[PDB]
Structure formats: C-alpha cells, structure tokens
Paper text:
Given the pivotal role of the extracellular sensor domain in signal recognition and transduction, we determined the crystal structure of the CzcS sensor domain (CzcS SD) in the presence of Zn(II) (referred as CzcS-Zn hereafter). The structure belongs to the C2 space group and it contains two molecules (CzcS SD, amino acids 40–166 in the CzcS protein) per asymmetric unit. The structure of CzcS SD is a mixed α/β-fold in nature, which can be divided into two domains. The N-terminal helix-loop-helix domain is composed of the H1 α-helix (residues 40–60), the connecting loop (residues 61–66), and the H2 α-helix (residues 67–81). The C-terminal domain contains five β-strands (S1-S5) and one 03B1-helix (H3). In the structure of CzcS-Zn, the N-terminal helix-loop-helix domain is tilted away from the central five anti-parallel β-sheet, which may be caused by the Zn(II) binding at the H1 and H1’ α-helices. Two Zn(II) ions are captured in the structure of CzcS-Zn. In the symmetry operation, this CzcS molecule can form a homodimer, and the Zn(II) is exclusively buried between the central parallel H1 and H1’ α-helices which constitute the dimer interface. A distorted tetrahedral geometry is adopted by Zn(II) to coordinate with the symmetric ligands (His55/Asp60 and His55’/Asp60) from the H1 and H1’ α-helices, respectively. The mutagenesis analyses corroborate the crucial role of the His55 and Asp60 in Zn(II) sensing.
Numbering used by the authors:
A (entry chain A): 38 to 132, 136 to 161
B (entry chain B): 36 to 133, 136 to 161
Write the structure that this text describes.
C-alpha cells in the first residue's frame, strides 16, 4: 500500500480514536455508543445521502459525509428528477469532484421520496 | 470531467442497495424515524469501510459494522496477532485474495475504561 493510502487510513483511525476516547457518551448504552461510532465512520466515508419530500422538495433526512454534500448540486439534480428525467439520473459536479445519482423511491406507507446519493470521486 | 461507466455502475449499485433497504425490508415499520435509521445503517454497510473493535482483555468483539467487501477474517486475525505481539503501532496490513485490502490497527482505551483493539479496514 502506498504512502498516501496509509496516511489517509491513519487519519481515519485518528477520527475513530477521537470518537472512542474523547466524545464517547458514558451515559449511553453500548448499542447507542456503537451507532455513534457508525455515524463517525460514515461521516468521512466520502458518501452522502439526502432524502427529499416528493411533493415540496423539502429535505426529510440527510446522512453521511459533508465533503460529498453540495446544496447547488442537489438542487440541480432534484430539478432534473422533477422534470421527468429518465431515472436514475446521474450528475457529475465539479467546482471538488462529486458523482451523484438520484431516483424516486416509494416508502412502504406509499410516501414518495426523492433519493439523492452523492460520492466524492 | 464526466464520471466513467465504472464509476456510474458502482454508484448505481449503491442506490439500488438503498432501494432494497426501503422497499424490500418486510419488517421495516412505517414509522418515519424508523425509516431514517434503516437508511443510515445501510449506507455504512456499503461504505467500503469496516470497523472491528475488540475487548483487549478477552478478545471478544465489542462492536462490528461496515462493509463486508472491506473485511477479511484472515486479515483481521493476522493484524490482531501483530497487535498482541507488541508490534509498533499503528500496525498497517496489506492483504490480497483476488481483492486487495488495506487495514490499520491500534490499541485504545475507551473513555469508560475498556481497553480495546481497533481494526479498521478499507477496500483499496
Ligand atoms: Zn469530538
Ligand atoms: Zn441500527
């Protein structure tokens, strides 16, 4: 493994260490503590997920790496989705190089949502 | 400046995994908070990263989650053995079996006092 790959995994381990040793909530039970560690692993995974309400376009849920998030990219991708573009819709976004993919999904209760998944390239 | 066919295919696979978690989970309840939790768990499951945290005193897993494509039973066993033989930390491990993995391991002490061994693995 290369010098930069090793450097990057060491920086990720340091994020895990900070979560375990400094931020750990002593009041939480182990399953909550485990999910909080999960949150920190996904927070620097290069992946971001936005769930929008199909009716209003308003954000319902947002998870993952802020580094893979962009308000402008997500607005543009939602516009293509609402403009009947063939799904799933792809979008390359460079200002930072993101690849994103969007599609409508239907929750179990029928609630239509727009699902926008972004990735750092 | 545009994403390749392989980049597109890989991201489409992840989106379809997310769709499986929303539309094909027979036991997922309708409660909107419960839906957020399922999606967040599934995002980690294909993040290309896997994290194993073991109690140093017993060897028993305390936490395990992430992507199984990033995990190797054999590699983790070899890395854990290097940690327990007081190799210099953090310990790096490359591993191949078709796929090529990069893992890093270190001993830590959780805030509540538990001594743990941390095995972080990544798809190269
Ligand atoms: Zn912190
Ligand atoms: Zn969960």
């Amino acid at each position: 493994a290369s010098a930069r790959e090793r450097e990057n995994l060491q920086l990720k381990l340091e994020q895990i260490r900070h979560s375990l040793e400094d931020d750990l909530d002593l009041r939480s039970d182990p399953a909550v503590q485990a999910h909080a560690l999960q949150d920190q692993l996904v927070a620097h995974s290069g992946l971001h997920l936005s769930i929008l309400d199909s009716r209003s376009g308003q954000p319902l849920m947002s998870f993952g790496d802020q580094a893979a998030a962009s308000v402008a990219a997500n607005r543009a991708l939602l516009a293509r989705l609402q403009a009947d573009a063939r799904q799933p819709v792809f979008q390359s976004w460079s200002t930072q190089r993101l690849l994103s993919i969007g599609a409508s999904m239907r929750m179990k209760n029928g609630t239509p949502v727009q699902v926008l998944l972004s990735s750092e390239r």
